[PDB]
Amino acid sequence: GPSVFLFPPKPKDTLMISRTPEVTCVVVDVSHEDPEVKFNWYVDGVEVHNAKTKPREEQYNSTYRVVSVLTVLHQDWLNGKEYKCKVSNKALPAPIEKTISKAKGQPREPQVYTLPPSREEMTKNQVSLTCLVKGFYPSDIAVEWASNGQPENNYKTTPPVLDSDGSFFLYSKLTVDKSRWQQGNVFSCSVMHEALHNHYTQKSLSLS
Amino acid sequence: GPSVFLFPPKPKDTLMISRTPEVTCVVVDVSHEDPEVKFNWYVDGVEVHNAKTKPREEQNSTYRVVSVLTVLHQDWLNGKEYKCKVSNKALPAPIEKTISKAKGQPREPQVYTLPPSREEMTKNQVSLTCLVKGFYPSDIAVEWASNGQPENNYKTTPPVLDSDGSFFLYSKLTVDKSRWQQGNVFSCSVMHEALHNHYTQKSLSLS
Amino acid sequence: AEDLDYLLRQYYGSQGGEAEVDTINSDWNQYQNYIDASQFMIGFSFFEESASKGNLWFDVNEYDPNNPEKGKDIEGTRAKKYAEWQPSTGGLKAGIFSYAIDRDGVAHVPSTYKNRTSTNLQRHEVDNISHTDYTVSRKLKTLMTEDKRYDVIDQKDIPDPALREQIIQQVGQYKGDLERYNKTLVLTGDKIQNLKGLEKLSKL
Amino acid sequence: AEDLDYLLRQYYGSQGGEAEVDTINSDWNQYQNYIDASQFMIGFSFFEESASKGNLWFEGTRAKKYAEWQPSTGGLKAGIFSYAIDRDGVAHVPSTYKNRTSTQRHEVDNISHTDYTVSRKLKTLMTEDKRYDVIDQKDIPDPALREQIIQQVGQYKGDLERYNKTLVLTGDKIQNLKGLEKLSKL
Ligand SMILES: *[C@@H]1O[C@H](CO[C@@H]2O[C@@H](C)[C@@H](O)[C@@H](O)[C@@H]2O)[C@@H](O[C@@H]2O[C@H](CO)[C@@H](O[C@@H]3O[C@H](CO[C@H]4O[C@H](CO)[C@@H](O)[C@H](O)[C@@H]4O[C@@H]4O[C@H](CO)[C@@H](O)[C@H](O)[C@H]4NC(C)=O)[C@@H](O)[C@H](O[C@H]4O[C@H](CO)[C@@H](O)[C@H](O)[C@@H]4O[C@@H]4O[C@H](CO)[C@@H](O)[C@H](O)[C@H]4NC(C)=O)[C@@H]3O)[C@H](O)[C@H]2NC(C)=O)[C@H](O)[C@H]1NC(C)=O
Numbered sequence: 001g002p003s004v005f006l007f008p009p010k011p012k013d014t015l016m017i018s019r020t021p022e023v024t025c026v027v028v029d030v031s032h033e034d035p036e037v038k039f040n041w042y043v044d045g046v047e048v049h050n051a052k053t054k055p056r057e058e059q060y061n062s063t064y065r066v067v068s069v070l071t072v073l074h075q076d077w078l079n080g081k082e083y084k085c086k087v088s089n090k091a092l093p094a095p096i097e098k099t100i101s102k103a104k105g106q107p108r109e110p111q112v113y114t115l116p117p118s119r120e121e122m123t124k125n126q127v128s129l130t131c132l133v134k135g136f137y138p139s140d141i142a143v144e145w146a147s148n149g150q151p152e153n154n155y156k157t158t159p160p161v162l163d164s165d166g167s168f169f170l171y172s173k174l175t176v177d178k179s180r181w182q183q184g185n186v187f188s189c190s191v192m193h194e195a196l197h198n199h200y201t202q203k204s205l206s207l208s
Numbered sequence: 209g210p211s212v213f214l215f216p217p218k219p220k221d222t223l224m225i226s227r228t229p230e231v232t233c234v235v236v237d238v239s240h241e242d243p244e245v246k247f248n249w250y251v252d253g254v255e256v257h258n259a260k261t262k263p264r265e266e267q268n269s270t271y272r273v274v275s276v277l278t279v280l281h282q283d284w285l286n287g288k289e290y291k292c293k294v295s296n297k298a299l300p301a302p303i304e305k306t307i308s309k310a311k312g313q314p315r316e317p318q319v320y321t322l323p324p325s326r327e328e329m330t331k332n333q334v335s336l337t338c339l340v341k342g343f344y345p346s347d348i349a350v351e352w353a354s355n356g357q358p359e360n361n362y363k364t365t366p367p368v369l370d371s372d373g374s375f376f377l378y379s380k381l382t383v384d385k386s387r388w389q390q391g392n393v394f395s396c397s398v399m400h401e402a403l404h405n406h407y408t409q410k411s412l413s414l415s
Numbered sequence: 416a417e418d419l420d421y422l423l424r425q426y427y428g429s430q431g432g433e434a435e436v437d438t439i440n441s442d443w444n445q446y447q448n449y450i451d452a453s454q455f456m457i458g459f460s461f462f463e464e465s466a467s468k469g470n471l472w473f474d475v476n477e478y479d480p481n482n483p484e485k486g487k488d489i490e491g492t493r494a495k496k497y498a499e500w501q502p503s504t505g506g507l508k509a510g511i512f513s514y515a516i517d518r519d520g521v522a523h524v525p526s527t528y529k530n531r532t533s534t535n536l537q538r539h540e541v542d543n544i545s546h547t548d549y550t551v552s553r554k555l556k557t558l559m560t561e562d563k564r565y566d567v568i569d570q571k572d573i574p575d576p577a578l579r580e581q582i583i584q585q586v587g588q589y590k591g592d593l594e595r596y597n598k599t600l601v602l603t604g605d606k607i608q609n610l611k612g613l614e615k616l617s618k619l
Numbered sequence: 620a621e622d623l624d625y626l627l628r629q630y631y632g633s634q635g636g637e638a639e640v641d642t643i644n645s646d647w648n649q650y651q652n653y654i655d656a657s658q659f660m661i662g663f664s665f666f667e668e669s670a671s672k673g674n675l676w677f678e679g680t681r682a683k684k685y686a687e688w689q690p691s692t693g694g695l696k697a698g699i700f701s702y703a704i705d706r707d708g709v710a711h712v713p714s715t716y717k718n719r720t721s722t723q724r725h726e727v728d729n730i731s732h733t734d735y736t737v738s739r740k741l742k743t744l745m746t747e748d749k750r751y752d753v754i755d756q757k758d759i760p761d762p763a764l765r766e767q768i769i770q771q772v773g774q775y776k777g778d779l780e781r782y783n784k785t786l787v788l789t790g791d792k793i794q795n796l797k798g799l800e801k802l803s804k805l
């Protein structure tokens with residue numbers, strides 16, 4: 001029978017004014033025989049009709065997937081309102097109801113520290129610019145890098161890790177050619193979190 | 209019905225001669241009514257009889273049953289498959305779960321210790337950082353030390369897949385700023401199959 | 416397409432709409448520009464043994480516990496539907512085909528097994544292997560050859576032998592082609608006396 | 620025994636032990652060498668009118684116990700039977716009349732029409748017993764093996780754990796031997 005999965009918005013989208021956050025609802029293993037899938041969306045038990053259902057997508061022979069995407073208001077999400085997705089189908093005994101809301105708990109402001117390469121790494125053609133973000137709660141966060149106003153894109157960020165004080169921390173690691181580091185270019189580590197002013201801070205990192 | 213989880217050995221145990229690595233097999237949600245749980249263990253599809261089943265544990269009216277197979281360091285590191293097979297009356301067919309070490313050219317970790325940020329030095333506790341990058345497979349172990357004694361107030365990130373196919377992580381030891389400024393030496397120990405004797409140490413002191 | 420003798424379009428399982436042939440008619444609407452209907456052949460599939468979700472089509476009857484021979488009955492089957500089905504345009508189709516004819520007559524696994532899988536396998540009597548008489552194949556062939564649309568064009572349709580000849584060469588040799596042919600007809604020569612029967616080419 | 624369809628063993632009254640079925644299990648231990656459990660049937664008796672000591676046998680009924688009872692070995696039993704079914708429903712004379720010899724009386728010694736209420740409850744009980752569920756692919760997957768085991772041990776799930784004789788498996792049709800482990804006493 002059909003299953004339902006309800007995914008929350010990307011944390012950057014909830015926190016940034018330039019972006020529009022979305023709750024997404026996926027129905028998998030839909031039969032070819034009874035294909036009509038009706039979605040109903042609720043925000044604190046209040047029906048909303050502004051959702052946008054994408055058409056079916058054959059996964060394998062005679063089995064489809066159906067996604068519905070509800071745009072959310074930044075404030076509603078951040079105030080921890082419940083988003084309920086209700087799915088109906090002929091091959092269901094009763095409709096399926098899945099709910100998600102934002103992680104509750106006293107927010108704690110992230111502390112952002114940029115760390116330069118190790119002397120030992122400077123023997124290599126590419127060096128590692130590091131950004132430490134610690135002491136934040138909840139674990140919803142987004143980290144990006146930049147340089148001269150342009151996005152730097154060759155980076156990887158660790159998942160949040162629970163620290164011993166109940167808060168979270170992570171590391172992001174931008175990799176750059178040593179040449180660019182030594183020439184004295186400035187790099188920026190952008191952190192986005194609900195407990196920051198305007199959900200945003202930037203720390204810089206250049207050669208001393 | 210009953211579920212099965214098969215956990216690999218702790219990477220330090222596979223890599224250190226002082227330690228004995230173990231594959232562990234856990235059966236959860238066993239009913240009071242049909243409680244008999246038989247385990248069968250296989251190493252490259254070859255049955256082994258040296259496993260050790262611990263008795264049931266009420267985790268209501270539902271038990272948990274753990275079976276622990278000791279492994280040989282070489283077998284694990286040569287990437288042999290460990291299969292755990294579970295039988296029960298409340299199972300339609302037996303459950304078979306397998307784990308092995310990730311196959312692939314091993315790559316030696318590069319260990320770099322990073323001192324606190326200038327900005328963190330305004331605080332009563334500061335973060336000593338250890339970056340380990342470019343290692344494969346992702347089985348690794350990181351510890352801290354100072355003056356021969358273990359430092360224990362640290363957390364390490366899970367391995368993260370880098371863009372070049374290797375792994376990296378960060379370990380973050382937290383110390384009182386006083387101890388950092390007084391010029392004590394700290395060590396970041398890394399244990400991995402691609403290191404000589406599966407071991408290196410990088411130092412970190414005030415500069 | 417210009418070099419093909421036949422296109423064999425596999426249409427196993429339901430193809431949408433009340434009569435479950437939406438995709439067939441929509442597809443034919445395009446196919447007809449490239450081939451003649453006399454080249455077009457639609458297929459159903461028999462029940463294969465140990466088939467899981469992804470290969471369960473229900474083109475033949477399901478197992479019945481009181482009638483072992485239900486798999487050999489073609490009544491109310493997609494197989495019979497395809498035998499009966501014809502294009503709206505162009506002309507009568509070439510025929511039908513079956514997949515896994517070696518399974519001719521075996522009943523389908525019941526609807527209750529519709530979502531069985533390779534891991535989660537729930538086997539059934541009908542997953543066993545059996546000798547076949549090709550009973551369904553012969554019923555479906557006989558059905559089509561006894562269909563009156565495939566009756567040939569006679570003097571009762573087109574009296575003039577000279578006109579009858581040319582229409583046959585251009586539209587087809589069956590009564591049911593006349594209704595459906597929807598392209599060009601070029602009539603030539605001094606042998607044609609009268610044009611009676613030409614009114615039957617309703618879609619020309 | 621070889622020519623019998625059924626042996627009907629009358630086990631009216633207590634048969635010894637805490638559960639009052641010692642004599643049944645001990646007897647079955649011998650009976651099983653001569654017949655299949657599918658041929659074995661145990662009986663209780665209803666209360667006959669004007670019965671004296673020597674014919675006083677007496678939920679919490681030996682009737683239900685016999686319906687429920689099964690052999691340890693061989694397989695599930697054939698069923699149960701009653702004596703004097705014409706007395707189905709009529710209650711027993713109390714224990715206090717335990718020795719009321721021919722040289723007493725009670726309301727229950729009078730004759731009455733019966734609806735066979737007890738008989739139908741005992742039949743329904745047995746047909747609702749899950750042990751008599753048939754062997755399916757959930758027990759023995761391989762159809763070829765399932766066939767042969769059914770022919771030899773019985774057609775019920777509860778036969779598998781009990782069958783304690785020989786099983787001869789033959790032919791090139793058998794692919795795997797899964798489910799054969801359920802014949803614990805083979
Ligand atoms: C999806 O459905 C379509 C049909 O539907 C059509 O499309 C859909 C979307 C809708 O629009 C429909 O309306 C529309 O009609 C399938 O297409 C036909 O469908 C049937 C089944 O429905 C297929 O039959 C299967 O074929 C495989 C083998 O298939 C060969 O051909 C395929 C295409 O050409 C190709 O994809 C395959 O890889 C394979 O090709 C070959 O590769 C080998 C090397 O690997 C090479 O030597 C060959 O020369 C080459 N052949 C070619 C190119 O033709 C067959 O294996 C299937 O049967 C297995 O499963 C059955 C149960 O499901 C079981 O009864 C069978 O016995 C058999 O199973 C096994 O038996 C052996 C021997 O005993 C044993 O060793 C195995 O362990 C056992 N394995 C398993 C797991 O059961 C089956 O007959 C047709 O291929 C296909 N095309 C035509 C022209 O009919 C499409 O295949 C479907 N997709 C999937 C993934 O199922």
Ligand SMILES: *[C@@H]1O[C@H](CO[C@@H]2O[C@@H](C)[C@@H](O)[C@@H](O)[C@@H]2O)[C@@H](O[C@@H]2O[C@H](CO)[C@@H](O[C@@H]3O[C@H](CO[C@H]4O[C@H](CO)[C@@H](O)[C@H](O)[C@@H]4O[C@@H]4O[C@H](CO)[C@@H](O)[C@H](O)[C@H]4NC(C)=O)[C@@H](O)[C@H](O[C@H]4O[C@H](CO)[C@@H](O)[C@H](O)[C@@H]4O)[C@@H]3O)[C@H](O)[C@H]2NC(C)=O)[C@H](O)[C@H]1NC(C)=O
Nearest residue numbers: 629630631632633634664667668669670671673674702703
């Ligand atoms: C002792 O108990 C037995 C039951 O207990 C079993 O055995 C003991 C040892 C323990 O191990 C128990 O754990 C175990 O359960 C009795 O067996 C059956 O019991 C019932 C009742 O308890 C008997 O019913 C009674 O039958 C009387 C007639 O008996 C016929 O059958 C006998 C056996 O074949 C035979 O010996 C008799 O001669 C008689 O048979 C016929 O004879 C005539 C004339 O020659 C022929 O014309 C017929 O064709 C013959 N028919 C047959 C089938 O042979 C009834 O007289 C008696 O009824 C009377 O009394 C009751 C109250 O007591 C009244 O309600 C009733 O109205 C009537 O007046 C009763 O129905 C049954 O006979 C036993 N046999 C079977 C197969 O069921 C033993 O009988 C019992 N022994 C004694 C001596 O009491």
